[PDB]
Amino acid sequence: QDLKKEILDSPRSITSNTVAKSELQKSIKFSGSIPEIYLDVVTKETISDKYKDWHFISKNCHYEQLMDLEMKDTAYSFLFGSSRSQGKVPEFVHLKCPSITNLLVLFGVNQEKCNSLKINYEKKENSRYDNLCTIFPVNKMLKFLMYFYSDDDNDDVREFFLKAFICLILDRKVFNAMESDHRLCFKVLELFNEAHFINSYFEIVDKNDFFLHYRLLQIFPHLQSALLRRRFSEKQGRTETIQQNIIKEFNEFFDCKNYKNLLYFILTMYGSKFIPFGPKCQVTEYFKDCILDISNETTNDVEISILKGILNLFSKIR
Amino acid sequence: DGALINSVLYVSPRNGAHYFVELTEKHLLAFEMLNSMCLLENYDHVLLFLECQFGKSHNLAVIPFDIILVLFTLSTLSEYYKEPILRANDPYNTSRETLSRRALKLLQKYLAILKEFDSEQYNLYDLELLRCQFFLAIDTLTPKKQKWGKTFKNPYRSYISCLEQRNTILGNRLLNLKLNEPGEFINMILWTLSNSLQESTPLFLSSHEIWMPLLEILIDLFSCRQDYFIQHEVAQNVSKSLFVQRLSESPLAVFFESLNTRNFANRFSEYVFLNCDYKLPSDNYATPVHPVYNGENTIVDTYIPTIKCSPLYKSQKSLALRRKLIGSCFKLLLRVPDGHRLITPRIVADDVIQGISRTLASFNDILQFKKFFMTENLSQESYFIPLLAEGTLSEILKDTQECVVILTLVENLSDGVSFCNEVIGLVKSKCFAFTEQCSQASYEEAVLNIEKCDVCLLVLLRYLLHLIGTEAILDAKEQLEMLHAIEKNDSGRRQWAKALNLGNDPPLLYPIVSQMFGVHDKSVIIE
Amino acid sequence: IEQVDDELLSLTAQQENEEQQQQRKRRRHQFAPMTLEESPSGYIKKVILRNFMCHEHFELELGSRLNFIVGNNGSGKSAILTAITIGLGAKASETNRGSSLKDLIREGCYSAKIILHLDNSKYGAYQQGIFGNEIIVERIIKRDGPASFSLRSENGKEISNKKKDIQTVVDYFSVPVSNPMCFLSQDAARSFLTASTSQDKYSHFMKGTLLQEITENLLYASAIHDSAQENMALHLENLKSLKAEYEDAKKLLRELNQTSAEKSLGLSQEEVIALFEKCRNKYKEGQKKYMEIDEALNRLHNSLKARDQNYKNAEKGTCFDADMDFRASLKVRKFSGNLSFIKDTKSLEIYILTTNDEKARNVDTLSGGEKSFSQMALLLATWKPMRSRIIALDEFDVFMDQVNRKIGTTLIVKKLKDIARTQTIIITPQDIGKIADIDSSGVSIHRMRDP
Amino acid sequence: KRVKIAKPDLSSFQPGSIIKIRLQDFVTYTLTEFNLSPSLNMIIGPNGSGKSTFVCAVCLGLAGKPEYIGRSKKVEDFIKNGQDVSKIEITLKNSPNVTDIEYIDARDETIKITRIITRSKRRSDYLINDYQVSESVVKTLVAQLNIQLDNLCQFLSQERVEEFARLKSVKLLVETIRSIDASLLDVLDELRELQGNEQSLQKDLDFKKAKIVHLRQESDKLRKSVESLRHDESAVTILDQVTAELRELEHTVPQQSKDLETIKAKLKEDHAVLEPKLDDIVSKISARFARLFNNVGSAGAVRLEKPKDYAEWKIEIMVKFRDNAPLKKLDSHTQSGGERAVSTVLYMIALQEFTSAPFRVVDEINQGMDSRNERIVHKAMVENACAENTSQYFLITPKLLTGLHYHEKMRIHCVMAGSWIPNPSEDPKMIHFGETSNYSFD
């Protein structure tokens, strides 16, 4: 009887992803249905990081204020293409949002992120589930940001504007919603020096985070060689050539078994002068030999098969 | 004009096409590789092949016409209603972008490359080959005969096209096959124009993300094809009779033949401004609209719409698309010789101008009217926008004032003095000024007509400044008298403002004229 | 059914063993920069067969890239291929040459020796410092006693006598000895070249590219997963019924607490408390079994998804390589062709357009010579995706007649002389010297003086 | 000798047909005469030339008002500009089945109706045998002739064509139930509601039976408590109430059990009486639909889906004219205009023989529809006209079609006027338009 009394104290008579799905549901920032099937598909990937990405905007945008700014921008006295000078029509924008930080808060960026425009890898800010937060159209946000260019100003303001632009373009939601023609993005890139832009981008993101490098190359392919000159600089590479640095990085990723980063690195490197397409190149042959060595086709990561296919396709390209 | 329409050095004209370009060994290998990858349904590798060498090298990778059609079909497979199918096709989304989005981005970038021929950036042979591929795709995208509501030809014998054995990409029929139907192309245009301003999330997603960009690309490609047809397909010197027949066979003529209806003017005016703020006149019959690809009006449970667009942004995009359609129609109309009219399309420039003017004058919301009459580039839309503005102003004066003053401002754009004298004559008649006949009860409607009339005058003044510049604003007494007459009109409006019928100040164009060419309200605020 | 759970646990253990084996493997290439045109190392420079089958000790120096043995049929024509397969290491049943290894030995002699000289002087060598410029593989087959092996070097120092070292060297050199298609016998070549049905072509292509075994393993794992999911649903229903019975037992235990009456309860309190204790033990063991089955099912589902993605990527890559090789091969005859693989019909369809027709007709709607050329191009396009250091083929003169045979030989020479990564040994009775296409470099003809 | 016009013998013409029409003081036609074939009528003219005006005047003459045809009312258009009165006369066969007639005996075979429209007087006045009468008498004469103006089936106009273009299955069910007596559907719906309340009472009785089963289970406990009173007092608080309620429910059970048999028998009898009539009507309409669509080379049937609920019955139309279009309900958006117009016209033609209306009038139907769907519908109308004793249709052709097929039974009528042609009033033989039998004697 006494043993049973202690046994009664003990509880009598799946949860594979219940905790993760529940935590995603609690922090959803969305007023809507949020069907359970979406949570199930998002929390049960187990293969790819499609749903985990850098999000510069983590809060719902101030719709009314942004609509008011758009109404003021659409119709004004000049009604002409905005010049880099004359204050960028400051008569209303200064009254609505005196500082760029206020505009970023209107976009939905939190004040803490605005204070430090950097990606915190320790806090896993680069890999986060989508916050499902409503955002303004990318073109209007880019025009509002361009209204705060202020070329005739100190270096700190220009650097802050460039870092804010780089963080905004790298955002998963902005990248998904970005228009096919990056006219405003190209204009902003042309405003700053290419080397300065690359230096600021490398300051914001990690050098080994090739996923963001591939995303930036998708946004701006012409910067690829320049980006490599920042990643595998001959002066910073000692006597070793850029190709030798690329081989060493490939070897270290191969040894570390960072297959996702290796795949993104391979995607980023190909198409440049250092690693051009072609069947006769020795580097692609070495890469294919290594991939064939690791590949077993019985219990292997999908990244190995994807790398094999991509390397074969690039080798076939003349 | 540009090198795009006047580059025929590497072309090999054929019976099917005059722009045909032969393939080199490297281009043939690229075409074969793309077709082989498309056959295995490996679209992700096709997009990677196109993106990896884009902008990173002097040479250009030419997309084959069949691959262009495949990309057009992929653009229709939006994530919001096809998320499970896309996820099944590409379980590992290495690009982290929808296949539809990547295909649309590639199509837009290649269209931008085609629009300006950079001989220094890219070799002429590659640019001509890309132009040939796009023109072949447009020829395959020819609309069928309009319905109120031959399978595949490969010019290149070097390789076997992927589209020969398949008619669907991922459960969706090819765009060329779908549009080559009696009631689909006009239906698609009506669907996108209706859903452009729709508040409903599925309808708004269907057009904004898919149909609006594809329609813009098609309009640009048809304009380029029309330019090529006028430049080369015509016989140069003509008796003015064969030229009309050739224009009836022009790509724009076939494009607008699918929208001929019974009366082109009224039906076209209703179609372009479908689901707009204007009140529908004469109880016109409703136009049936249905989704083109299965459930375009449905959103899959997996997709979550996290994007909100302001009504102004949607209106601006919709009015820009409408302006592009009207510009294409006017570009086709301007080529018609005077006196003669096209045989296959029953289109008259005067009828279209009158219909557009009637639709614009019927607008009850000033924001849409301003969006239609405000353009980033005046030179691009200089051929039809002044005519529409003059027609709208004439109709507004006709309804507001019993006396209709004939307006010759479009021909007066050449001479600023004549334009200013005509403006002085119009303001002296009080047609431009607020009408005393209008009752206090209908004051808001009179203000709505007056502001639209002011917008039309501002558009005409902007075109006059584009044509003559600022050289004799004060040097010529006529322009100074015109500014004084504008001040007198402002005083007439201020008389009703002092009447205190409504708190809102009546719209005054004096500040806008002062900003544009009024030299700071003349001497009023020069100090 | 507990047998389904046992099969699921065994499959999970096998997957864990396979992933541990995958983790154990390391890269074996050091990427020496060096300088393409030069062939890689590992090709067979020379073969000597002493007292092997019919002929006595014979020396044959094979070429670096392409070989044409002109030994006549009935004079130990297939002896060279059989000796190479035995020396490199292959199953006796796979070779299908001879009733037994004892019969391979020459009659009247107790022992037979097979010696192969793999080249290590060039790049890509395996332990060139230890083995030197050449690796000598010697196999001794005796009627009495097990077969002996020696991995001796040039000086004759026997590095090893085990079978694992030979397999490791062959794997490093990438010679698919286990794959029967890389070394085609007369029967295998006849079966592959004479295939007419699209399903037969698809089956041969899948078997040759080693994709059929992956599909069979994936299908078996999928069937085991479906059976395990059905058994898991049955176990969940049984666990819920047991949980309801244990909840009733807990209510009886609460009644036991209230009593702690017998005629109202019916069963003795000691029996009921013992039943509750055993029911609690069964509940705990059932919960542990359910958790183990759920974890195994989830791991199997994730492994199946990964395997499906990997198999799809590998199949797409192999099909793309085969299609590109086939398109390149068909350019020789001024034809435009393509391959289509259909899972719904499980068939491979070849579409070829010639100079006369403007539409790509089915390969079946062609002449015998065109079909034979298409079959030869398919054989080359199937050999291409699997990178093989050494490929051996027997005679093909009986499958093509007159002009088409010459065209097929020309296609083989053109497609195989250019590649330096693969060394090809072709054994045909027809005199290659008669063919005008012998001037091309990289082709080695070894004609046996004795008929 | 003198040329004599063909005798307008009403006996030869089928009852309800019109032989001669006189139009006096109308737009562009001050004096005109029209003849209609007994089998089918074909009129060729551009829209706005007065052919549509002539058809509207003919519709107004038979107790017709412009607002009752689902179109805009324009009395002034009918009146000739400058003439005080516009006159339209219609002659019809008379049979002794219609009451409320003036100056006409039952044996008489002629019923002449005259409509005069004048700007000065605003009243509805009609003439029978040139005798003034109120519009109510003509309207009741039209109602007793089984011809209806308000109903869309007998008369089809552009607004009615638009309404028919987008037609829901519920509208088809309403039309089918209004053509036949609608009392049967109402009785069946009332019986279905009675079955629903009876089923609710039956499930309540099943719940009461479950309660009686629980009472039977606890009766043993009550007997155990009673024997224990004679571990004690288990549920002994209530002994009489449970027995009384069990007895009351046991007495209630036969009363509910008696029901659900007579109500179901009445429902089964009503369903058995109603089913064959609707089944034969559906089979006949489906056979007519298939025989009419055989010319189109498509298979279609008008099917009536009957779910368990009587109110849930719906009409399905099978469409095969286009291979791409799957079988689905008729709709304007998904299907082409010409095919939909042909399908609806054939559906209206199918419900003509069953209806007692003497004739069916269609407006804006003969207008071209792609020159292929219109051609096949013209062939179908010719095949229908081949059968004898068929209704007369007033076709309107605003747009001329090349290579029109003209049947011998039907005669084309042209109202177009030529500059070379003399004025119709001055020329004795030009008063008749689109008539050839008049020139020949008899």
PDB file of N, CA and C in Angstrom, chain A residues 30 38 48-50 63 70 74 77-79 132-135 140 175-176 178-181 211 218 221 224 260 264 303 313 317, chain B residues 29 37 45 49 52 54 56 91-97 101 105 108 301-302 305-310 312-313 316 371 374 462 515:
ATOM      1  N   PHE A  30       1.697  37.955 -36.888  1.00  0.00           N
ATOM      2  CA  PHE A  30       0.737  37.943 -38.021  1.00  0.00           C
ATOM      3  C   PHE A  30      -0.688  37.853 -37.485  1.00  0.00           C
ATOM      4  N   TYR A  38       1.253  25.030 -42.588  1.00  0.00           N
ATOM      5  CA  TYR A  38       2.427  25.912 -42.813  1.00  0.00           C
ATOM      6  C   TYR A  38       3.458  25.707 -41.700  1.00  0.00           C
ATOM      7  N   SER A  48      17.271  21.328 -45.531  1.00  0.00           N
ATOM      8  CA  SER A  48      17.740  22.633 -46.055  1.00  0.00           C
ATOM      9  C   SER A  48      17.381  23.766 -45.097  1.00  0.00           C
ATOM     10  N   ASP A  49      18.052  24.907 -45.250  1.00  0.00           N
ATOM     11  CA  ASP A  49      17.823  26.069 -44.354  1.00  0.00           C
ATOM     12  C   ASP A  49      16.955  27.084 -45.094  1.00  0.00           C
ATOM     13  N   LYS A  50      16.018  26.606 -45.912  1.00  0.00           N
ATOM     14  CA  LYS A  50      15.201  27.533 -46.732  1.00  0.00           C
ATOM     15  C   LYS A  50      14.435  28.492 -45.826  1.00  0.00           C
ATOM     16  N   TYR A  63       2.030  51.287 -41.448  1.00  0.00           N
ATOM     17  CA  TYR A  63       1.354  51.450 -42.756  1.00  0.00           C
ATOM     18  C   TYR A  63       0.848  52.874 -42.982  1.00  0.00           C
ATOM     19  N   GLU A  70       4.123  58.322 -48.972  1.00  0.00           N
ATOM     20  CA  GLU A  70       3.938  58.003 -50.408  1.00  0.00           C
ATOM     21  C   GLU A  70       3.026  59.052 -51.052  1.00  0.00           C
ATOM     22  N   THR A  74       4.255  61.352 -54.086  1.00  0.00           N
ATOM     23  CA  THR A  74       3.674  61.234 -55.445  1.00  0.00           C
ATOM     24  C   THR A  74       3.393  62.618 -56.034  1.00  0.00           C
ATOM     25  N   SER A  77       5.434  70.125 -55.412  1.00  0.00           N
ATOM     26  CA  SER A  77       5.566  71.287 -56.328  1.00  0.00           C
ATOM     27  C   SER A  77       6.468  70.985 -57.531  1.00  0.00           C
ATOM     28  N   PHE A  78       7.649  70.411 -57.304  1.00  0.00           N
ATOM     29  CA  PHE A  78       8.598  70.194 -58.428  1.00  0.00           C
ATOM     30  C   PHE A  78       8.062  69.115 -59.369  1.00  0.00           C
ATOM     31  N   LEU A  79       7.588  67.993 -58.813  1.00  0.00           N
ATOM     32  CA  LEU A  79       7.067  66.853 -59.618  1.00  0.00           C
ATOM     33  C   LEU A  79       8.142  66.382 -60.607  1.00  0.00           C
ATOM     34  N   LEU A 132       6.969  36.670 -40.685  1.00  0.00           N
ATOM     35  CA  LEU A 132       5.643  36.906 -41.322  1.00  0.00           C
ATOM     36  C   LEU A 132       5.165  38.325 -40.989  1.00  0.00           C
ATOM     37  N   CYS A 133       6.070  39.303 -41.055  1.00  0.00           N
ATOM     38  CA  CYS A 133       5.698  40.709 -40.752  1.00  0.00           C
ATOM     39  C   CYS A 133       5.444  41.452 -42.065  1.00  0.00           C
ATOM     40  N   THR A 134       4.321  42.165 -42.144  1.00  0.00           N
ATOM     41  CA  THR A 134       3.967  42.894 -43.389  1.00  0.00           C
ATOM     42  C   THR A 134       4.997  43.993 -43.659  1.00  0.00           C
ATOM     43  N   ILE A 135       5.388  44.150 -44.924  1.00  0.00           N
ATOM     44  CA  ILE A 135       6.414  45.173 -45.282  1.00  0.00           C
ATOM     45  C   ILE A 135       5.879  46.054 -46.413  1.00  0.00           C
ATOM     46  N   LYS A 140       9.155  51.754 -52.985  1.00  0.00           N
ATOM     47  CA  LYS A 140       8.836  52.942 -52.154  1.00  0.00           C
ATOM     48  C   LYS A 140       9.866  53.069 -51.031  1.00  0.00           C
ATOM     49  N   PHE A 175      14.616  40.561 -50.493  1.00  0.00           N
ATOM     50  CA  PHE A 175      15.187  39.856 -51.668  1.00  0.00           C
ATOM     51  C   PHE A 175      14.071  39.126 -52.421  1.00  0.00           C
ATOM     52  N   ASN A 176      13.177  38.473 -51.680  1.00  0.00           N
ATOM     53  CA  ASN A 176      12.046  37.760 -52.325  1.00  0.00           C
ATOM     54  C   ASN A 176      11.125  38.773 -53.002  1.00  0.00           C
ATOM     55  N   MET A 178      11.877  41.824 -54.027  1.00  0.00           N
ATOM     56  CA  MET A 178      12.594  42.820 -54.866  1.00  0.00           C
ATOM     57  C   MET A 178      12.152  42.667 -56.322  1.00  0.00           C
ATOM     58  N   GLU A 179      12.059  43.784 -57.045  1.00  0.00           N
ATOM     59  CA  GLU A 179      11.656  43.736 -58.472  1.00  0.00           C
ATOM     60  C   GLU A 179      12.769  43.106 -59.305  1.00  0.00           C
ATOM     61  N   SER A 180      12.405  42.597 -60.480  1.00  0.00           N
ATOM     62  CA  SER A 180      13.403  41.923 -61.349  1.00  0.00           C
ATOM     63  C   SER A 180      14.480  42.915 -61.790  1.00  0.00           C
ATOM     64  N   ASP A 181      14.086  44.153 -62.086  1.00  0.00           N
ATOM     65  CA  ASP A 181      15.066  45.196 -62.481  1.00  0.00           C
ATOM     66  C   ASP A 181      15.460  45.980 -61.229  1.00  0.00           C
ATOM     67  N   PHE A 211      26.832  32.028 -48.357  1.00  0.00           N
ATOM     68  CA  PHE A 211      25.404  32.106 -48.746  1.00  0.00           C
ATOM     69  C   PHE A 211      25.025  33.561 -49.035  1.00  0.00           C
ATOM     70  N   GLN A 218      23.868  37.400 -56.808  1.00  0.00           N
ATOM     71  CA  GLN A 218      22.588  37.347 -57.554  1.00  0.00           C
ATOM     72  C   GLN A 218      22.059  38.772 -57.726  1.00  0.00           C
ATOM     73  N   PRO A 221      25.853  40.840 -59.939  1.00  0.00           N
ATOM     74  CA  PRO A 221      26.837  39.904 -60.484  1.00  0.00           C
ATOM     75  C   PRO A 221      28.166  40.587 -60.833  1.00  0.00           C
ATOM     76  N   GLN A 224      31.264  40.435 -58.578  1.00  0.00           N
ATOM     77  CA  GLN A 224      31.852  39.118 -58.199  1.00  0.00           C
ATOM     78  C   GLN A 224      33.379  39.168 -58.112  1.00  0.00           C
ATOM     79  N   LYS A 260      26.942  22.563 -47.041  1.00  0.00           N
ATOM     80  CA  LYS A 260      26.100  23.702 -47.481  1.00  0.00           C
ATOM     81  C   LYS A 260      26.990  24.902 -47.818  1.00  0.00           C
ATOM     82  N   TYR A 264      27.646  26.696 -51.528  1.00  0.00           N
ATOM     83  CA  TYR A 264      27.471  28.151 -51.786  1.00  0.00           C
ATOM     84  C   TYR A 264      28.805  28.759 -52.232  1.00  0.00           C
ATOM     85  N   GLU A 303      23.598  17.842 -50.338  1.00  0.00           N
ATOM     86  CA  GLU A 303      24.539  18.874 -50.838  1.00  0.00           C
ATOM     87  C   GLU A 303      25.596  18.212 -51.730  1.00  0.00           C
ATOM     88  N   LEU A 313      27.638  20.444 -64.623  1.00  0.00           N
ATOM     89  CA  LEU A 313      27.005  21.442 -65.522  1.00  0.00           C
ATOM     90  C   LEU A 313      28.033  22.522 -65.865  1.00  0.00           C
ATOM     91  N   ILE A 317      29.790  23.660 -69.571  1.00  0.00           N
ATOM     92  CA  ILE A 317      29.684  25.035 -70.144  1.00  0.00           C
ATOM     93  C   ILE A 317      31.018  25.415 -70.789  1.00  0.00           C
TER      94      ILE A 317
ATOM     95  N   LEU B  29      26.007  24.428 -78.735  1.00  0.00           N
ATOM     96  CA  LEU B  29      26.249  23.562 -77.556  1.00  0.00           C
ATOM     97  C   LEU B  29      25.420  24.081 -76.376  1.00  0.00           C
ATOM     98  N   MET B  37      18.687  19.886 -70.273  1.00  0.00           N
ATOM     99  CA  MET B  37      18.341  20.124 -68.847  1.00  0.00           C
ATOM    100  C   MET B  37      16.825  20.325 -68.714  1.00  0.00           C
ATOM    101  N   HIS B  45      18.591  23.921 -62.553  1.00  0.00           N
ATOM    102  CA  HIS B  45      19.905  23.959 -63.244  1.00  0.00           C
ATOM    103  C   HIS B  45      19.846  24.902 -64.452  1.00  0.00           C
ATOM    104  N   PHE B  49      22.278  27.949 -64.853  1.00  0.00           N
ATOM    105  CA  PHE B  49      23.127  28.098 -66.061  1.00  0.00           C
ATOM    106  C   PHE B  49      22.992  29.524 -66.581  1.00  0.00           C
ATOM    107  N   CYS B  52      24.569  32.069 -63.713  1.00  0.00           N
ATOM    108  CA  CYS B  52      26.005  31.977 -63.328  1.00  0.00           C
ATOM    109  C   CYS B  52      26.885  32.827 -64.249  1.00  0.00           C
ATOM    110  N   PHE B  54      25.803  35.462 -66.086  1.00  0.00           N
ATOM    111  CA  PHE B  54      25.094  36.718 -66.439  1.00  0.00           C
ATOM    112  C   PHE B  54      25.865  37.912 -65.884  1.00  0.00           C
ATOM    113  N   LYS B  56      28.986  38.555 -65.808  1.00  0.00           N
ATOM    114  CA  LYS B  56      30.334  38.271 -65.249  1.00  0.00           C
ATOM    115  C   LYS B  56      31.357  38.134 -66.384  1.00  0.00           C
ATOM    116  N   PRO B  91      13.079  20.318 -53.757  1.00  0.00           N
ATOM    117  CA  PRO B  91      13.012  20.191 -52.306  1.00  0.00           C
ATOM    118  C   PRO B  91      14.128  21.008 -51.643  1.00  0.00           C
ATOM    119  N   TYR B  92      15.324  21.015 -52.233  1.00  0.00           N
ATOM    120  CA  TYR B  92      16.421  21.852 -51.686  1.00  0.00           C
ATOM    121  C   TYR B  92      16.484  23.165 -52.467  1.00  0.00           C
ATOM    122  N   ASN B  93      15.866  24.217 -51.930  1.00  0.00           N
ATOM    123  CA  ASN B  93      15.833  25.515 -52.649  1.00  0.00           C
ATOM    124  C   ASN B  93      17.174  26.194 -52.398  1.00  0.00           C
ATOM    125  N   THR B  94      18.187  25.819 -53.173  1.00  0.00           N
ATOM    126  CA  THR B  94      19.547  26.370 -52.972  1.00  0.00           C
ATOM    127  C   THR B  94      19.542  27.877 -53.242  1.00  0.00           C
ATOM    128  N   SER B  95      18.791  28.321 -54.253  1.00  0.00           N
ATOM    129  CA  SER B  95      18.726  29.764 -54.602  1.00  0.00           C
ATOM    130  C   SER B  95      17.916  30.557 -53.566  1.00  0.00           C
ATOM    131  N   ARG B  96      17.054  29.894 -52.784  1.00  0.00           N
ATOM    132  CA  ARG B  96      16.181  30.582 -51.784  1.00  0.00           C
ATOM    133  C   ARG B  96      15.254  31.559 -52.508  1.00  0.00           C
ATOM    134  N   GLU B  97      14.912  31.244 -53.752  1.00  0.00           N
ATOM    135  CA  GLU B  97      13.967  32.099 -54.505  1.00  0.00           C
ATOM    136  C   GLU B  97      13.022  31.190 -55.284  1.00  0.00           C
ATOM    137  N   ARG B 101       9.862  33.456 -59.740  1.00  0.00           N
ATOM    138  CA  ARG B 101      10.523  34.764 -59.526  1.00  0.00           C
ATOM    139  C   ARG B 101      11.843  34.798 -60.296  1.00  0.00           C
ATOM    140  N   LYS B 105      12.774  37.360 -63.275  1.00  0.00           N
ATOM    141  CA  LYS B 105      13.947  38.260 -63.140  1.00  0.00           C
ATOM    142  C   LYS B 105      14.845  38.100 -64.362  1.00  0.00           C
ATOM    143  N   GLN B 108      13.190  39.757 -67.414  1.00  0.00           N
ATOM    144  CA  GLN B 108      13.245  41.241 -67.355  1.00  0.00           C
ATOM    145  C   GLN B 108      14.672  41.715 -67.642  1.00  0.00           C
ATOM    146  N   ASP B 301      -2.718  26.800 -48.531  1.00  0.00           N
ATOM    147  CA  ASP B 301      -2.595  26.977 -47.062  1.00  0.00           C
ATOM    148  C   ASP B 301      -1.128  27.187 -46.682  1.00  0.00           C
ATOM    149  N   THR B 302      -0.204  26.489 -47.346  1.00  0.00           N
ATOM    150  CA  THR B 302       1.232  26.585 -46.967  1.00  0.00           C
ATOM    151  C   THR B 302       1.718  28.030 -47.136  1.00  0.00           C
ATOM    152  N   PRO B 305       0.584  35.139 -47.022  1.00  0.00           N
ATOM    153  CA  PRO B 305       0.841  36.436 -47.621  1.00  0.00           C
ATOM    154  C   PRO B 305       1.310  37.417 -46.540  1.00  0.00           C
ATOM    155  N   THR B 306       2.572  37.837 -46.623  1.00  0.00           N
ATOM    156  CA  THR B 306       3.144  38.742 -45.592  1.00  0.00           C
ATOM    157  C   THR B 306       3.471  40.100 -46.231  1.00  0.00           C
ATOM    158  N   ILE B 307       2.882  40.401 -47.390  1.00  0.00           N
ATOM    159  CA  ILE B 307       3.241  41.669 -48.092  1.00  0.00           C
ATOM    160  C   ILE B 307       1.993  42.546 -48.213  1.00  0.00           C
ATOM    161  N   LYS B 308       2.112  43.812 -47.815  1.00  0.00           N
ATOM    162  CA  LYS B 308       0.977  44.756 -47.962  1.00  0.00           C
ATOM    163  C   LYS B 308       1.408  45.911 -48.864  1.00  0.00           C
ATOM    164  N   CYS B 309       0.586  46.225 -49.864  1.00  0.00           N
ATOM    165  CA  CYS B 309       0.905  47.341 -50.786  1.00  0.00           C
ATOM    166  C   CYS B 309      -0.138  48.442 -50.608  1.00  0.00           C
ATOM    167  N   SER B 310       0.320  49.687 -50.491  1.00  0.00           N
ATOM    168  CA  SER B 310      -0.604  50.835 -50.314  1.00  0.00           C
ATOM    169  C   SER B 310      -1.453  51.018 -51.574  1.00  0.00           C
ATOM    170  N   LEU B 312      -2.102  53.657 -53.214  1.00  0.00           N
ATOM    171  CA  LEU B 312      -1.405  54.563 -54.163  1.00  0.00           C
ATOM    172  C   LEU B 312      -0.412  53.768 -55.016  1.00  0.00           C
ATOM    173  N   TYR B 313       0.324  52.839 -54.408  1.00  0.00           N
ATOM    174  CA  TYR B 313       1.313  52.036 -55.170  1.00  0.00           C
ATOM    175  C   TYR B 313       0.582  51.207 -56.226  1.00  0.00           C
ATOM    176  N   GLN B 316      -0.684  53.461 -58.956  1.00  0.00           N
ATOM    177  CA  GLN B 316       0.416  53.970 -59.811  1.00  0.00           C
ATOM    178  C   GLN B 316       0.801  52.884 -60.816  1.00  0.00           C
ATOM    179  N   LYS B 371      -2.164  60.243 -61.384  1.00  0.00           N
ATOM    180  CA  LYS B 371      -1.249  59.105 -61.654  1.00  0.00           C
ATOM    181  C   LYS B 371      -1.180  58.880 -63.163  1.00  0.00           C
ATOM    182  N   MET B 374       0.739  61.962 -64.709  1.00  0.00           N
ATOM    183  CA  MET B 374       2.116  62.282 -64.251  1.00  0.00           C
ATOM    184  C   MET B 374       3.053  61.169 -64.710  1.00  0.00           C
ATOM    185  N   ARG B 462       3.940  71.613 -69.173  1.00  0.00           N
ATOM    186  CA  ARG B 462       5.184  70.818 -69.051  1.00  0.00           C
ATOM    187  C   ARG B 462       5.682  70.427 -70.443  1.00  0.00           C
ATOM    188  N   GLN B 515       6.593  77.262 -59.494  1.00  0.00           N
ATOM    189  CA  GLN B 515       7.713  76.293 -59.389  1.00  0.00           C
ATOM    190  C   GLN B 515       8.219  75.919 -60.782  1.00  0.00           C
TER     191      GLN B 515
END
